[PDB]
Amino acid sequence: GCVGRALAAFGDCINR
Amino acid sequence: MSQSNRELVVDFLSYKLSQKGYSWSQFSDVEENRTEAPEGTESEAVKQALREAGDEFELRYRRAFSDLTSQLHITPGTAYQSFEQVVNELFRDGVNWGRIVAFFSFGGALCVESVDKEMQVLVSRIAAWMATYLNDHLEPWIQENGGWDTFVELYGNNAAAESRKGQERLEHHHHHHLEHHHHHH
Ligand SMILES: *CC(=O)Nc1ccc(/N=N/c2ccc(NC(=O)C*)c(S(=O)(=O)O)c2)cc1S(=O)(=O)O
Numbered sequence: 001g002c003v004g005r006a007l008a009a010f011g012d013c014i015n016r
Numbered sequence: 017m018s019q020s021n022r023e024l025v026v027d028f029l030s031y032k033l034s035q036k037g038y039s040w041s042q043f044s045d046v047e048e049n050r051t052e053a054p055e056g057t058e059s060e061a062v063k064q065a066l067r068e069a070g071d072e073f074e075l076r077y078r079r080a081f082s083d084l085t086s087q088l089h090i091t092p093g094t095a096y097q098s099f100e101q102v103v104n105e106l107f108r109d110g111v112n113w114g115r116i117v118a119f120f121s122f123g124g125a126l127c128v129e130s131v132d133k134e135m136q137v138l139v140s141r142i143a144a145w146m147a148t149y150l151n152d153h154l155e156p157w158i159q160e161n162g163g164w165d166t167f168v169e170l171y172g173n174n175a176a177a178e179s180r181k182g183q184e185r186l187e188h189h190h191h192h193h194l195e196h197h198h199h200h201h
Contacts, residue, residue, distance in 0.1 A: 008105030014114035
């Protein structure tokens with residue numbers, strides 16, 4: 001669980 | 017030029033073990049036994065940009081990171097299938113400039129997740145498959161967005177930015193260029 005989903009998501013925050 | 021993506025991975029994994037008190041080279045093989053990329057051919061700026069953007073990624077996921085090792089089941093080489101889960105999303109949902117720093121960031125962490133369980137042997141293995149994934153999958157996309165140099169153009173190392181900004185505040189000017197881009201041989 002997570003990780004795939006989590007880093008996918010949290011990764012779109014590398015800007016703001 | 018191309019294999020410089022290796023550096024970007026390696027340099028980060030190196031720093032990752034450094035903040036834990038482990039060594040990359042003690043558990044390495046990447047540039048250890050074979051020479052892929054230089055110590056910083058083009059990458060000197062791109063890896064410098066990469067580590068900063070990577071840091072921006074780390075703290076953000078660090079909340080879950082320490083717990084996630086149970087989820088990924090950080091273990092023998094099949095931890096790349098654990099990191100697969102994530103690199104899978106990571107690629108489909110928007111491979112951008114800063115997005116790629118996430119890949120090499122959690123990859124550098126994937127390293128330590130291995131060393132954590134005292135399996136620091138994954139350290140070199142991960143870095144291999146990380147840079148390779150970049151080589152095969154990411155590099156084309158990167159080039160569509162300009163390249164690694166372009167990444168530092170956008171999100172480059174601001175430490176060095178401020179370093180040169182000091183004298184640039186007075187405006188040095190007087191700098192003309194007869195050069196046209198980076199030439200190759
Ligand atoms: C189990 C798991 O980890 N699941 C999961 C999935 C997704 C997220 N977070 N996604 C997400 C998406 C976008 C943002 N913000 C941005 O748009 C930049 C965030 S943020 O605001 O937290 O940075 C998060 C988390 C998790 S969780 O680890 O279970 O919480």
